[PDB]
Coordinates of C-alpha atoms and ligand atoms in Angstrom, one line a residue:
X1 CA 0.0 0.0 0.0
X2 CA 1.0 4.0 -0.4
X3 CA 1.1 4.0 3.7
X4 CA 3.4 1.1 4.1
X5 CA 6.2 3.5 1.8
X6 CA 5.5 6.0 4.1
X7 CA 6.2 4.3 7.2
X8 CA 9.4 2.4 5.6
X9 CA 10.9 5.4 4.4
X10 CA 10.5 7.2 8.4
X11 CA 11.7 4.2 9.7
X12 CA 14.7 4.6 7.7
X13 CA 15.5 7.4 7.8
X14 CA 14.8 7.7 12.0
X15 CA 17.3 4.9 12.1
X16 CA 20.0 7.1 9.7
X17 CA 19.1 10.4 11.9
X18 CA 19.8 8.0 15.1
X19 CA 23.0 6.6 13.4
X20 CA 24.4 10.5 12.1
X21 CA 23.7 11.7 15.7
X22 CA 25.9 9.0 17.1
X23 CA 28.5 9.8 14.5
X24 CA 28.4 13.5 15.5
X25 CA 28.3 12.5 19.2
X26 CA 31.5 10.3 18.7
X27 CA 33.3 12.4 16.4
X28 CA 33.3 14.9 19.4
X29 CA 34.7 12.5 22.3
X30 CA 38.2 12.4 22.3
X31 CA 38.1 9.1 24.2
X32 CA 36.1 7.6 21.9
X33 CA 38.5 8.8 18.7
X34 CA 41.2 7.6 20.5
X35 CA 39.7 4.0 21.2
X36 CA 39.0 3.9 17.2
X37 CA 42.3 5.2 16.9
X38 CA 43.7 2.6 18.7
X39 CA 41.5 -0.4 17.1
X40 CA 42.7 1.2 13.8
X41 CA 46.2 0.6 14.1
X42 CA 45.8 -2.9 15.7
X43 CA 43.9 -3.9 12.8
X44 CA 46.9 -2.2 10.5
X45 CA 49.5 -4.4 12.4
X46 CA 47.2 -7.3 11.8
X47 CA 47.0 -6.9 8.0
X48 CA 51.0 -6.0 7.1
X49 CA 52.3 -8.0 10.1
X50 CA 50.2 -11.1 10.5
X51 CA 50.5 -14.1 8.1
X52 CA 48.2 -17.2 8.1
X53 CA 45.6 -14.8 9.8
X54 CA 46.0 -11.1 7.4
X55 CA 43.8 -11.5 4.1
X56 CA 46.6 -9.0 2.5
X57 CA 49.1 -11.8 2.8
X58 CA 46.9 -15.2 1.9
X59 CA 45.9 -13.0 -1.5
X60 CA 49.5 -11.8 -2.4
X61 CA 50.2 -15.5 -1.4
X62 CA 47.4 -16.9 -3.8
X63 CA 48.3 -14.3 -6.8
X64 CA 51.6 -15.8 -7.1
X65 CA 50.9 -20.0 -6.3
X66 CA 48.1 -19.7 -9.2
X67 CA 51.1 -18.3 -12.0
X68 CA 53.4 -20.8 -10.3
X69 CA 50.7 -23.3 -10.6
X70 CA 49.8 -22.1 -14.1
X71 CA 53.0 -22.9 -15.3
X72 CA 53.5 -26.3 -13.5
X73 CA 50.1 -27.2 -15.5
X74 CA 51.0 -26.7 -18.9
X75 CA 54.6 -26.3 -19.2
X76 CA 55.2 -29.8 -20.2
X77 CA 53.3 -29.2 -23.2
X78 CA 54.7 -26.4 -24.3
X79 CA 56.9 -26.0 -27.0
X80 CA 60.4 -24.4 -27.1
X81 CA 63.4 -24.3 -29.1
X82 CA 66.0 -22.4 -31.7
X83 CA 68.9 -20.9 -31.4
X84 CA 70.0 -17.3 -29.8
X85 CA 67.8 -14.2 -30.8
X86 CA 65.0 -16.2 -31.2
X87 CA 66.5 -18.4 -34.7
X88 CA 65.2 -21.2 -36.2
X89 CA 67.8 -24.2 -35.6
X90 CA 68.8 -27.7 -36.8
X91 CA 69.7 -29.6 -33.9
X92 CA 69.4 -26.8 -30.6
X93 CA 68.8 -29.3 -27.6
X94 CA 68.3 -27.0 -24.3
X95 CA 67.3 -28.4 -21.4
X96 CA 66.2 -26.1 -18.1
X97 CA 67.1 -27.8 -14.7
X98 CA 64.3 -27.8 -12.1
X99 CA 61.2 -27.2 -14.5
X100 CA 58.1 -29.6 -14.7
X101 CA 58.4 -31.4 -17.6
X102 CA 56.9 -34.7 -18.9
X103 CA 57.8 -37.0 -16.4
X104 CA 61.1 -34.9 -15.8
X105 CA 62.6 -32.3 -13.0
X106 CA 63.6 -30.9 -16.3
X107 CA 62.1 -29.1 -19.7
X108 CA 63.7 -30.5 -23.0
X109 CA 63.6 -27.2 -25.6
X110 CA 64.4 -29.3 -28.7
X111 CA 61.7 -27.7 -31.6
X112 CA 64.0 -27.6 -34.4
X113 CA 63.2 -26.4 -37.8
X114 CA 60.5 -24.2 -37.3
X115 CA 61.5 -20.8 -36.4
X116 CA 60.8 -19.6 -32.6
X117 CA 57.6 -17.0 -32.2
X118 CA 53.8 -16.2 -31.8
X119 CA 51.8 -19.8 -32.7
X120 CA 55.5 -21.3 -32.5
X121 CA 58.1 -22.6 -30.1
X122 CA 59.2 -20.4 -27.4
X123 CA 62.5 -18.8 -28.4
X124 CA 65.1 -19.5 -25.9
X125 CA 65.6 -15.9 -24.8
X126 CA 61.8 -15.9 -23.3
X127 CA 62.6 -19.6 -21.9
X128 CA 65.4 -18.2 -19.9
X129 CA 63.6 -15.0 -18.8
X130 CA 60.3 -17.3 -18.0
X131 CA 62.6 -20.0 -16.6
X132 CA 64.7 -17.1 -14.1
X133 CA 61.3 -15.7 -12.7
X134 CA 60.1 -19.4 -11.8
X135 CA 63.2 -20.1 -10.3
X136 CA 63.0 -17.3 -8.3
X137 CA 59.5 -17.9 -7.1
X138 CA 59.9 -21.6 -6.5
X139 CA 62.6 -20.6 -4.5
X140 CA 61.0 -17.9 -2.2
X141 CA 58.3 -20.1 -1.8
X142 CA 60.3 -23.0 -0.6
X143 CA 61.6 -20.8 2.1
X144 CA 58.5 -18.7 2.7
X145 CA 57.0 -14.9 2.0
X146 CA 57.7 -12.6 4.4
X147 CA 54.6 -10.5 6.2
X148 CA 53.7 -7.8 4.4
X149 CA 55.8 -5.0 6.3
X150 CA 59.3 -6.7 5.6
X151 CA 60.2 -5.3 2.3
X152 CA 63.4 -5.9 2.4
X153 CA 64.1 -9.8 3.0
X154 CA 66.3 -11.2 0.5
X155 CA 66.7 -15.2 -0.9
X156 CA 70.1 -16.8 -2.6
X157 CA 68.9 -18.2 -6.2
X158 CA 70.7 -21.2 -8.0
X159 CA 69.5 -22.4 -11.2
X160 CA 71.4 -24.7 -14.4
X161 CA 70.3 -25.5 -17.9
X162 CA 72.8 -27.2 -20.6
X163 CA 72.8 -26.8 -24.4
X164 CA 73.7 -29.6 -26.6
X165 CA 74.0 -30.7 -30.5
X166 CA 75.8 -28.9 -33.5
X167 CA 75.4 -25.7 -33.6
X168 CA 73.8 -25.0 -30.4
X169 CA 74.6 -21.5 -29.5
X170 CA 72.4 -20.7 -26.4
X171 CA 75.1 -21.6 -24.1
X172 CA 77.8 -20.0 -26.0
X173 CA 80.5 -17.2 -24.4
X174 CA 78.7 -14.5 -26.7
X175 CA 75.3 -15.3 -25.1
X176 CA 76.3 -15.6 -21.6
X177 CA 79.0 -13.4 -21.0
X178 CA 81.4 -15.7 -19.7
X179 CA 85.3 -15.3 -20.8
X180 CA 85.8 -18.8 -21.7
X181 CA 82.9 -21.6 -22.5
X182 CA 84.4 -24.7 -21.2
X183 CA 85.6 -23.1 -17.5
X184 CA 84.6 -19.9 -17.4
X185 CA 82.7 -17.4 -14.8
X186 CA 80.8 -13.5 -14.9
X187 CA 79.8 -11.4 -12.7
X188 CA 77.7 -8.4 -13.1
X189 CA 75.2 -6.2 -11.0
X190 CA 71.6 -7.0 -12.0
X191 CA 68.7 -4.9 -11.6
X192 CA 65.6 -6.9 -10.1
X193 CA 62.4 -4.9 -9.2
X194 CA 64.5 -1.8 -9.0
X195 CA 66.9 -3.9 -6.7
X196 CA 70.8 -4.5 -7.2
X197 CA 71.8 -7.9 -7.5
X198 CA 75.2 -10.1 -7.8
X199 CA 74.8 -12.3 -10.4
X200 CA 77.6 -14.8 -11.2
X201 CA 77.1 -17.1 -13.9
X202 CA 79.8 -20.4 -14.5
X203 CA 79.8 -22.2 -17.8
X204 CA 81.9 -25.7 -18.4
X205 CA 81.9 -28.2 -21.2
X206 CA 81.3 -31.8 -20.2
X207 CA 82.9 -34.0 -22.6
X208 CA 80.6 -37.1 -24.0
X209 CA 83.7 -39.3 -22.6
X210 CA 83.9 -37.6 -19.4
X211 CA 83.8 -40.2 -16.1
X212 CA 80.3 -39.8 -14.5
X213 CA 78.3 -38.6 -18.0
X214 CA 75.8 -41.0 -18.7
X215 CA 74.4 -38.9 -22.1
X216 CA 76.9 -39.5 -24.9
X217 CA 77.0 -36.3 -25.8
X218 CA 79.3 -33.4 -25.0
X219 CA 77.3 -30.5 -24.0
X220 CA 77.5 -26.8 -21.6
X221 CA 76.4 -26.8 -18.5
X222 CA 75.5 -22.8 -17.5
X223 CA 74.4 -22.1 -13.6
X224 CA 73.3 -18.8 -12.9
X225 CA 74.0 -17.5 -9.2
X226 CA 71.4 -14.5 -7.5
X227 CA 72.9 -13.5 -4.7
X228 CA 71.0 -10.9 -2.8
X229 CA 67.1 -11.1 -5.0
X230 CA 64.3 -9.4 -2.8
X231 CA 61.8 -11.5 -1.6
X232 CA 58.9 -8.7 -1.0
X233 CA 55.7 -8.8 -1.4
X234 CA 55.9 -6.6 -4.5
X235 CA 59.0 -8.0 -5.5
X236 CA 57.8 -11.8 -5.8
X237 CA 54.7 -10.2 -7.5
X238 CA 56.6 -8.6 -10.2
X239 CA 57.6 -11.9 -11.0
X240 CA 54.9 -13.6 -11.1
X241 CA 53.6 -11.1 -13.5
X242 CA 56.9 -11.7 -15.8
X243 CA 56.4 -15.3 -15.5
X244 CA 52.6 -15.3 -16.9
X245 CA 53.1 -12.0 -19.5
X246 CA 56.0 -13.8 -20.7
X247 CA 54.3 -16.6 -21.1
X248 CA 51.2 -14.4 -22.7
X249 CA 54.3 -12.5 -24.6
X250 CA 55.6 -15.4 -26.5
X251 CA 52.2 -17.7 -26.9
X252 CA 53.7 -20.7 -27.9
X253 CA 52.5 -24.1 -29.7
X254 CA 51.7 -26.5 -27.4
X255 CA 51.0 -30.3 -28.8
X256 CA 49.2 -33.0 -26.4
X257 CA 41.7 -30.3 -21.4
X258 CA 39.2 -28.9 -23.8
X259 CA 42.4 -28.4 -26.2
X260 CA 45.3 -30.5 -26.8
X261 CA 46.9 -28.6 -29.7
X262 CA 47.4 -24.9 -30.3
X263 CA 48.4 -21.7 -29.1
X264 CA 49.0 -21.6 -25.1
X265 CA 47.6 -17.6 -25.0
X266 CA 44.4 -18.8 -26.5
X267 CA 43.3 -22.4 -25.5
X268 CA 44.2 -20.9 -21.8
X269 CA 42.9 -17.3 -22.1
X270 CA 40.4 -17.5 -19.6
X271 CA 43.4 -18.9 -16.7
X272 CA 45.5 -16.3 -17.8
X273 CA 43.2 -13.1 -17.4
X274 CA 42.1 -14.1 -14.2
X275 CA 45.9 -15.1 -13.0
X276 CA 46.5 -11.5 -14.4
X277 CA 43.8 -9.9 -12.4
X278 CA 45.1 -11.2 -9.8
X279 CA 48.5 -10.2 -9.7
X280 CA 47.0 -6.6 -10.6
X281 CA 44.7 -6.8 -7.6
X282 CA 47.5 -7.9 -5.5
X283 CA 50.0 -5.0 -6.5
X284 CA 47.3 -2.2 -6.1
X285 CA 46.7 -4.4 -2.5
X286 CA 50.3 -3.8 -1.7
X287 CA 50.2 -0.1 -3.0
X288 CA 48.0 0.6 -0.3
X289 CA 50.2 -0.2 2.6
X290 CA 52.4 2.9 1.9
X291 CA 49.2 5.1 3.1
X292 CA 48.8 2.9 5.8
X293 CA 52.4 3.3 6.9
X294 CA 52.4 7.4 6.6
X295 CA 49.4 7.9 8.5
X296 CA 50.2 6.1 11.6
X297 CA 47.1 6.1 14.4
X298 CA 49.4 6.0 17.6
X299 CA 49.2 9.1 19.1
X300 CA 46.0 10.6 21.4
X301 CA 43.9 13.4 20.3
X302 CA 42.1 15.9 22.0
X303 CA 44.2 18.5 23.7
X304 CA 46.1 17.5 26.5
X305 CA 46.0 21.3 28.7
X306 CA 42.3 21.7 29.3
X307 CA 40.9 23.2 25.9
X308 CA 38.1 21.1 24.9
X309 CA 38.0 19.6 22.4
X310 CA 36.7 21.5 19.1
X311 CA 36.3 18.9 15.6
X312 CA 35.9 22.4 14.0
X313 CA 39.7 23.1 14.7
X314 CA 41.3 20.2 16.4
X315 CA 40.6 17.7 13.9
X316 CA 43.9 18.2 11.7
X317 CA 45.0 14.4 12.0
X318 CA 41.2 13.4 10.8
X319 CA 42.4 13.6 7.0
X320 CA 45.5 10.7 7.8
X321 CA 43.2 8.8 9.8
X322 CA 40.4 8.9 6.7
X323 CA 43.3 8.0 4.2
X324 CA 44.4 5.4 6.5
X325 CA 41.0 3.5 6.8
X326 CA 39.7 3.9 3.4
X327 CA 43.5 2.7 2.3
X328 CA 42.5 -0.9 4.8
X329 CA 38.8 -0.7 3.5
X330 CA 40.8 -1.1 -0.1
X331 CA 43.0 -4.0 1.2
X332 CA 40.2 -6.1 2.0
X333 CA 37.9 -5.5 -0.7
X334 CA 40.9 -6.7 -3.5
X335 CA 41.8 -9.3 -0.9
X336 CA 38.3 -10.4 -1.3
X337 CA 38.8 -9.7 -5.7
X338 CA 42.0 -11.9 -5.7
X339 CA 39.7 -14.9 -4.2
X340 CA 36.7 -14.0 -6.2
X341 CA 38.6 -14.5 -9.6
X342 CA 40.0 -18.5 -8.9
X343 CA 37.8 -19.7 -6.5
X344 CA 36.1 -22.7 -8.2
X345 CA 32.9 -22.0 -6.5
X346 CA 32.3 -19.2 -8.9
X347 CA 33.4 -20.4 -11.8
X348 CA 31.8 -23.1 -14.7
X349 CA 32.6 -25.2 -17.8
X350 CA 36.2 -25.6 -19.0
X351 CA 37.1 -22.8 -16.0
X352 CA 36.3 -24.4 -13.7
X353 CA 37.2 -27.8 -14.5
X354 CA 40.8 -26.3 -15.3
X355 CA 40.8 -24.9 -11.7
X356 CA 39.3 -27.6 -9.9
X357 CA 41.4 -30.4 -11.7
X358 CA 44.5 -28.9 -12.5
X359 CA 45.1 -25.9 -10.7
X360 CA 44.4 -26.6 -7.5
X361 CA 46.0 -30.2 -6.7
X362 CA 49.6 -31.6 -6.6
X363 CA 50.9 -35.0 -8.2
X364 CA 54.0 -35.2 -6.1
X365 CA 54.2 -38.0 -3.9
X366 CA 54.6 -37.3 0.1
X367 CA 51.9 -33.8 5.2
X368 CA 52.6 -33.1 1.5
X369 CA 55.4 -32.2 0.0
X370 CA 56.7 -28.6 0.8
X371 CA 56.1 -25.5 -1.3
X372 CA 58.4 -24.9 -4.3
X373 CA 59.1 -29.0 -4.7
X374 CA 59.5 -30.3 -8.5
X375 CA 59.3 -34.3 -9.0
X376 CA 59.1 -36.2 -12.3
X377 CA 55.3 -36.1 -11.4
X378 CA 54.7 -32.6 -10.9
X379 CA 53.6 -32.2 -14.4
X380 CA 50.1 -30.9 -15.2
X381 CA 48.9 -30.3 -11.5
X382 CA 49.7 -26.7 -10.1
X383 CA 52.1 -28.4 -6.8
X384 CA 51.5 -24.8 -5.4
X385 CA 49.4 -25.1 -2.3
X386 CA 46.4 -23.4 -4.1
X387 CA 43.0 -25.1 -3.3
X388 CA 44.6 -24.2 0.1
X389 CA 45.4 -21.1 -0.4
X390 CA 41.7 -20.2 -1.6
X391 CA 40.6 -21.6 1.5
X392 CA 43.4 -19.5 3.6
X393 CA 42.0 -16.6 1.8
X394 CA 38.2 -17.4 2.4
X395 CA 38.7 -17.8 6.1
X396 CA 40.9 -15.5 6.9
X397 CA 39.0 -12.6 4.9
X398 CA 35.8 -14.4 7.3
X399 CA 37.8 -14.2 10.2
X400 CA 38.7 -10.6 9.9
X401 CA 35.3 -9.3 10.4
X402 CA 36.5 -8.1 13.9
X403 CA 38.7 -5.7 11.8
X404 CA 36.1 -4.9 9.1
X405 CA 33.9 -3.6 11.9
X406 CA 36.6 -1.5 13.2
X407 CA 37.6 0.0 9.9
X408 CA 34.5 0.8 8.9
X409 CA 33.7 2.6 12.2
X410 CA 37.2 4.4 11.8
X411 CA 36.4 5.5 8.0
X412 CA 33.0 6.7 9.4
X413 CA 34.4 9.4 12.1
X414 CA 37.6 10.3 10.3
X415 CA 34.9 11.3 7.2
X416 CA 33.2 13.1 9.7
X417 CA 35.4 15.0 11.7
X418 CA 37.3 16.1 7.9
X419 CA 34.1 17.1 7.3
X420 CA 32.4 18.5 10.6
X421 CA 30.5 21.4 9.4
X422 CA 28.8 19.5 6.4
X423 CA 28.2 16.5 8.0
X424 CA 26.6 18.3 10.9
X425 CA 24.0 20.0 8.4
X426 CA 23.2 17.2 7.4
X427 CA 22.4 16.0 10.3
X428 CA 20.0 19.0 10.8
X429 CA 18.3 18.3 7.0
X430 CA 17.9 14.8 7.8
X431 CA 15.8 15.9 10.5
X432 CA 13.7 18.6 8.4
X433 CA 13.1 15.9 6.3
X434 CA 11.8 13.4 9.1
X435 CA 9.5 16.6 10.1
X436 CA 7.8 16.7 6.6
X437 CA 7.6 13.0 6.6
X438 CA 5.9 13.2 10.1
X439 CA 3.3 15.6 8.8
X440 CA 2.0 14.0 6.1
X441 CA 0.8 10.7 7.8
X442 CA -2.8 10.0 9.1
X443 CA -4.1 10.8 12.4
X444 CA -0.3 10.5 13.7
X445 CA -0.8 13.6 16.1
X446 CA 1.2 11.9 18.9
X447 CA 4.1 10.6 16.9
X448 CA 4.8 14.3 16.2
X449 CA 7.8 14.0 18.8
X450 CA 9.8 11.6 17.1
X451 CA 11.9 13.8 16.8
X452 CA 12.8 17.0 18.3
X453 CA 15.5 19.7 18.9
X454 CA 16.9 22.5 21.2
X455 CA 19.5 25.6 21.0
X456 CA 22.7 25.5 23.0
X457 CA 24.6 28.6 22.3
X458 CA 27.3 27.7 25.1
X459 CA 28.6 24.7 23.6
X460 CA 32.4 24.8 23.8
X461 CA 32.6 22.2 20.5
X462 CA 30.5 24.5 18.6
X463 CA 27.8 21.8 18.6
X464 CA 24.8 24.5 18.8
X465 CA 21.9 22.4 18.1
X466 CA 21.1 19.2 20.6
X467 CA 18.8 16.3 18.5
X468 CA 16.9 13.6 20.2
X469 CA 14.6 10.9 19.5
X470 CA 11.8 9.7 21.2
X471 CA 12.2 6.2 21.9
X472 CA 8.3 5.7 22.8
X473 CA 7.5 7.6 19.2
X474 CA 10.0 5.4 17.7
X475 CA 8.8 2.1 18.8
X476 CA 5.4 2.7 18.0
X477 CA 6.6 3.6 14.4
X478 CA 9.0 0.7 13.9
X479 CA 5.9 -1.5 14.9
X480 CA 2.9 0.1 12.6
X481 CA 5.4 -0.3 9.8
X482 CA 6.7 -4.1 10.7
X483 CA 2.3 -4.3 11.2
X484 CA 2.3 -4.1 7.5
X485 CA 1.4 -7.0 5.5
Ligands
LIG1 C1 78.7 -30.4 -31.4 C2 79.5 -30.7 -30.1 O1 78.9 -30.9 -29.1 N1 80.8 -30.6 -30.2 C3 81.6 -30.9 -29.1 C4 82.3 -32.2 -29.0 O2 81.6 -33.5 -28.9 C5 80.5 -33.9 -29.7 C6 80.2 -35.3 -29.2 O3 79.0 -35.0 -28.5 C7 79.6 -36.4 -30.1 O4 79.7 -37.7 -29.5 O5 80.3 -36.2 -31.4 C8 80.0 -35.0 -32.1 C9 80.5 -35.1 -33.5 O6 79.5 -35.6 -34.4 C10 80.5 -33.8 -31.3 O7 81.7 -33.2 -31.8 O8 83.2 -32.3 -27.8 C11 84.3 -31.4 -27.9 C12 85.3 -31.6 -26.8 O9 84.6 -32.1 -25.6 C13 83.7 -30.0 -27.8 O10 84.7 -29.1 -28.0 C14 85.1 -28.2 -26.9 O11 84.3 -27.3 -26.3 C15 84.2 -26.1 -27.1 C16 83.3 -25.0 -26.6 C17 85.7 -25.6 -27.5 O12 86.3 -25.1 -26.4 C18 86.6 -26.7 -28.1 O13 87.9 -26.2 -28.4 C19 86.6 -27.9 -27.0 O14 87.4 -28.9 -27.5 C20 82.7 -29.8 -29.0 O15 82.1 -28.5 -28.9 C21 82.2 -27.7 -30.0 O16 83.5 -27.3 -30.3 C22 83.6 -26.5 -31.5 C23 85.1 -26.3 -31.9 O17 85.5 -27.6 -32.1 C24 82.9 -25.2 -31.3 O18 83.5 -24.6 -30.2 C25 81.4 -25.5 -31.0 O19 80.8 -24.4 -30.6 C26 81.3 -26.5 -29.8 O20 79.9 -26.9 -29.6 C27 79.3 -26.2 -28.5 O21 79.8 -26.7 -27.3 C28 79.4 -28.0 -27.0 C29 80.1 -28.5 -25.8 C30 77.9 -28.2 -27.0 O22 77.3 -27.5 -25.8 C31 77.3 -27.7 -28.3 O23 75.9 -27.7 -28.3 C32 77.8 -26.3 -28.6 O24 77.3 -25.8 -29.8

C-alpha cells in the first residue's frame, strides 16, 4: 500500500538520523577517537604484520601459487626451441634444470626447424627469462614470504640449464657473458624490481667421454648464481607477472583439457586473465600499505592542557586517519577480488574444470610435500598449495570481520570530523526531512515528537543544536510499519 512507503521510508530514515547523531556525538569524544584510533592501528598491524591470519598476505600469497601453478600445468606441453635471438635451428637441444616437464625435473627445448615465435616454439631468450622468474618464485616459496611489512628480506637463487648438439649457440660465451665456455665465470650487477643484485654465472663443457656422463654427448652446462634477490611482497609479485606475461608474450605451440593442440595464449585465455587480475589486484593491495604506513594512528587526540575539544579546529590528524581506513577498507575489498577470480565455487565449464582439476592439486608423492618442490610427477597439477590457499584466503577474509567492523567505524568518524560542518548540516536536513515526513501521515498527532531539537549557544565544541529521539514515538513507528502485511 501507499502507507506502508510512508512508514518504511520514516523508519529509515529515524534509524539514519539516530545513526548521524551518534557519529556526531563520537566524532566529538576524544576518548572515543582515540579508542577507534587505537582499534585502527591494531587492525593495520594485523593486516601487514600477520601471516596465516591477514587476508593481504593469503591474497599476495594466492596471486603468485596460481602463476606458479599455471606454469606447473601446462609447461610440459609447451613448446620451445631455436637458437640465440630467437633463430630457427637444426639440432638446438636445451634443457632447463628444475622445471616440470613430462615426467622430468627438467624441460627438454628441442623444436628444431621451425622458427621460434607467436603460434611457434618459445624462443630461448623468453625460456630463460620465463625460466629465471620461476626459479626465483619456486625458490622464495620453498623458504616462505615474508609478512607484508618486511620489504626488504632477500633469498640466494641457483639455477642450471645445458645446451647440446651442433650448432647449439644458447650456451655460448657471446650469449652468456662468460670469458671462456668450457671453464669460465661473470659477474655483473643485476637490476631486479628496481633492486641491485650479484649475479655470477659459471659455464663448463662436459665431454661425451667424461667419467660420471651418462648422455653421450658433449654439452655446456651454465648455472646462474642471484645472490642478494628481494623476496617482498611486491618484488615476488613482479615476477609472477613476468612469468605469466611472458608466457602471454611469447604464446607458444603446445601439442598434447578442452584443447590439446594450439596456441598456449588462446586455448588458456580464460586462466590467464584471471591469474592476471590477480597479480593486478594484489600490487594495487600492496600499494596501499604505503598510506597505511604514513598515517600512523598512535598518538591521542584531544588536547592535553584543558581546551576542549573542538572537531571544528582540532581535527587536523582526521584527514590521515580517513586515508588510512579507506587505504584498509581497499586491502580487504581486492583481498576479497583476488579470491573472487579462482575460487572454483564461482566459476563453470572448461574454467572451472581447469581450476578444480588442475590448478588446484599436486601430483608429487609425500603432510605433503613442501612449497616450491619439482618431482618427475609434478607435471600438469599446479604443486603450489592453491586449493589451500583459496581456503586460507576465504577464512581469513571471514575471520577478519573483527577488523572490518573496526575500519569501517574508523572511515565513518575520520569522514566526519574532515568534514564536521557538512556533515553536521546534514544531520539538521535529515531531520527537516523526518518533520515533513511526520506531517504527512494519518491521524499521527502523537508521533509528532519523534523527533525533536533544542539551541545551545554555550557549547564549547560548537555543537549548537542538541537532537533527540523519542524512543516511545520510535517504537510505535517501527511497529505500525513491521504491522504491515
Ligand atoms: C657439437 C658438439 O657438441 N661438439 C663438441 C664435442 O663432442 C661432440 C660429441 O658430443 C659427439 O659424440 O660427437 C659429435 C661429432 O659428431 C660432437 O663433436 O666435444 C668437444 C670436446 O669435448 C667440444 O669441443 C670443446 O668445447 C668447445 C666449446 C671448444 O672449447 C673446443 O675447443 C673444445 O674442445 C665440442 O664442442 C664444439 O667445439 C667447436 C670447436 O671444435 C665449437 O667450439 C662448437 O661451438 C662447440 O659446440 C658447442 O659446445 C658443445 C660443448 C655443446 O654444448 C654444443 O651444443 C655447442 O654448440
Amino acid at each position: 500500500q501507499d502507507l506502508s512507503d510512508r512508514y518504511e521510508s520514516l523508519n529509515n530514515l529515524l534509524n539514519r538520523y539516530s545513526t548521524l547523531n551518534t557519529l556526531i556525538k563520537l566524532s566529538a569524544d576524544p576518548s572515543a577517537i582515540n579508542a577507534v584510533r587505537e582499534n585502527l592501528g591494531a587492525s593495520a598491524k594485523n593486516l601487514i604484520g600477520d601471516k596465516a591470519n591477514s587476508p593481504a598476505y593469503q591474497a599476495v600469497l594466492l596471486a603468485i601459487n596460481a602463476a606458479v601453478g599455471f606454469w606447473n600445468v601446462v609447461g610440459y606441453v609447451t613448446q620451445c626451441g631455436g637458437n640465440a635471438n630467437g633463430q630457427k635451428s637444426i639440432s638446438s637441444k636445451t634443457i632447463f634444470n628444475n622445471e616440470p616437464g613430462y615426467r622430468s625435473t627438467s624441460i627438454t627445448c628441442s623444436l628444431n626447424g621451425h622458427s621460434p615465435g607467436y603460434y611457434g616454439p618459445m624462443s630461448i631468450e623468453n625460456f630463460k627469462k620465463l625460466n629465471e622468474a620461476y626459479q626465483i618464485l619456486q625458490t622464495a616459496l620453498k623458504r616462505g614470504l615474508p609478512a607484508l611489512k618486511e620489504n626488504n628480506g632477500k633469498v640466494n637463487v641457483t639455477y642450471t640449464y645445458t645446451c647440446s648438439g651442433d650448432g647449439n649457440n644458447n650456451c655460448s660465451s657471446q650469449v652468456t657473458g662468460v670469458n671462456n665456455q668450457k671453464d669460465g665465470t661473470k659477474t655483473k650487477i643485476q637490476t631486479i624490481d628496481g633492486k641491485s643484485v650479484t649475479t655470477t654465472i659459471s659455464s663448463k663443457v662436459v665431454d661425451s667421454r667424461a667419467d660420471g656422463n651418462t648422455t653421450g654427448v658433449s654439452y655446456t652446462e651454465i648455472t646462474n648464481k642471484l645472490e642478494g634477490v628481494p623476496d617482498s611482497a611486491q618484488a615476488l609479485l613482479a615476477q609472477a607477472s613476468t612469468l605469466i606475461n611472458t608466457i602471454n608474450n611469447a604464446c607458444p605451440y603446445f601439442h598434447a583439457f578442452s584443447t590439446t593442440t594450439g596456441k598456449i595464449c588462446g586455448a588458456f585465455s580464460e586462466e590467464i586473465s584471471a591469474i592476471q587480475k590477480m597479480i593486478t589486484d594484489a600490487q594495487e593491495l600492496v600499494n596501499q600499505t604505503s598510506v597505511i604506513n604514513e598515517h600512523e594512528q598512535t598518538t591521542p587526540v584531544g588536547n592535553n592542557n584543558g581546551k576542549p575539544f573542538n572537531p571544528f579546529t582540532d581535527a587536523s590528524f582526521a584527514q590521515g586517519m580517513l586515508a588510512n581506513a579507506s587505504a584498509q577498507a581497499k586491502m580487504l575489498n581486492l583481498a576479497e577480488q583476488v579470491g573472487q577470480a579462482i575460487n572454483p565455487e564461482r566459476l563453470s565449464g572448461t574454467f572451472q574444470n581447469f581450476v578444480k582439476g588442475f590448478l588446484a592439486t599436486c601430483n608429487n608423492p609425500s603432510q605433503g610435500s613442501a612449497p616450491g618442490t619439482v618431482t618427475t610427477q609434478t607435471f600438469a597439477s599446479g604443486c603450489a598449495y592453491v586449493g589451500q590457499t583459496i581456503t586460507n584466503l576465504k577464512n581469513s577474509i571471514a575471520h577478519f570481520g573483527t577488523q572490518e567492523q573496526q575500519i569501517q567505524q574508523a572511515e565513518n568518524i575520520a569522514d566526519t570530523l574532515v568534514n564536521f560542518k557538512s556533515r553536521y548540516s546534514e544531520l539538521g536536513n535529515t531531520y527537516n526531512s523526518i518533520t515533513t515526513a511526520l506531517s504527512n501521515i494519518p491521524n499521527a498527532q502523537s508521533l509528532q515528537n519523534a523527533v525533536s531539537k533544542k539551541n545551545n549557544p554555550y557549547s564549547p565544541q560548537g555543537i549548537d543544536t542538541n537532537y533527540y529521539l523519542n524512543q516511545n514515538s520510535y517504537n510505535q513507528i517501527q511497529t505500525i510499519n513491521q504491522e504491515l502485511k
